[PDB]
């Protein structure tokens, strides 16, 4: 029931998870195999977190209307499709790891796996934790 207000609520409910957790991801729509796509989504929902929602309400208007409360640079709805997956175990978690590793492996596309850094001051791998 993707209605006017329903998609208005969908954007806010999908942006709340991003503002409360870590960077999310997406998945495009070019070609999908039964076993390949399901197992990848099954593995993604296991490692990154069971709260992953492949639902997509990221239209060029709905995304910029609700989500833009924080990080007003969220007008990149140019993706071919969206399949979201949160990262509870810290930032740049297995969600980011799986998306960055499956962007060119065992998948068609992942909407370039741009990511959503919380401060967005600069783009960094954040792969170093000196200790």
């Amino acid at each position: 029931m993707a209605l006017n207000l329903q998609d208005k609520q969908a954007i806010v409910a999908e942006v709340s998870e991003v503002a409360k957790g870590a960077l999310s991801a997406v998945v495009a729509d070019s070609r999908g195999v039964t076993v390949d796509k399901m197992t990848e989504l099954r593995k993604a929902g296991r490692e990154a977190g069971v709260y992953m929602r492949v639902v997509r309400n990221t239209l060029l208007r709905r995304a910029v209307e609700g989500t833009p409360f924080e990080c007003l640079k969220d007008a990149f709805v140019g993706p071919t499709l969206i399949a979201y997956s949160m990262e509870h175990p810290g930032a740049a978690a297995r969600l980011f790891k799986e998306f960055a590793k499956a962007n060119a492996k065992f998948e068609v596309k992942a909407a370039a796996f741009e990511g959503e850094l919380i401060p967005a001051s600069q783009i960094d791998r954040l792969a170093t934790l000196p200790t």
């Binding site: 195999v33 039964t34 076993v35 989504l41 099954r42 929902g45 296991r46 069971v50 992953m52």
Partner: protein
């Protein structure tokens, strides 16, 4: 492979891996013979389903053989052997379609959580529980 390349779905219970004598020649599109039917399935399906429902993979790989990722014991063979009542659909309204208890589902999960998984291990348990209970009956235990 679990994703059978030639998924001609006609295969007798896991006692004899995909018995063509019981499937007949209507599923003759498969090319299974003694080279790739009695080597892996007939040797690795003993503790999965002994005379119980377990489909046999008819996949043929590209390496002149048939060998790829299989899965854990069938849910329809574990949750029913741990239940006793071998009934199901078709006659699920007149009588019980089998027993689907918490213990039966837990045992099915503990047996089929190796490779047959979903969004999580408990999700695979939910798949096992649904595979046992959706036959038409579920036990209140």
């Amino acid at each position: 492979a679990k994703k059978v390349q030639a998924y001609v779905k006609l295969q007798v219970a896991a006692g004899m891996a995909n018995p063509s004598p019981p499937v007949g020649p209507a599923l003759g599109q498969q090319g299974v013979n003694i080279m790739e039917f009695c080597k892996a399935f007939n040797a690795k399906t003993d503790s999965i389903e002994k005379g119980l429902p377990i489909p046999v993979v008819i996949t043929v790989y590209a390496d002149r053989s048939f060998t790829f990722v299989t899965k854990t014991p069938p849910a329809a063979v574990l949750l029913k052997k741990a239940a006793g009542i071998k009934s199901g659909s078709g006659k699920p309204n007149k009588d019980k379609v089998g027993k689907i208890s918490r213990a039966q589902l837990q045992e099915i999960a503990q047996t089929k959580a190796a490779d047959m998984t979903g969004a999580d291990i408990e999700a695979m348990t939910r798949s096992i529980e649904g595979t046992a209970r959706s036959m038409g009956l579920v036990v209140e235990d």
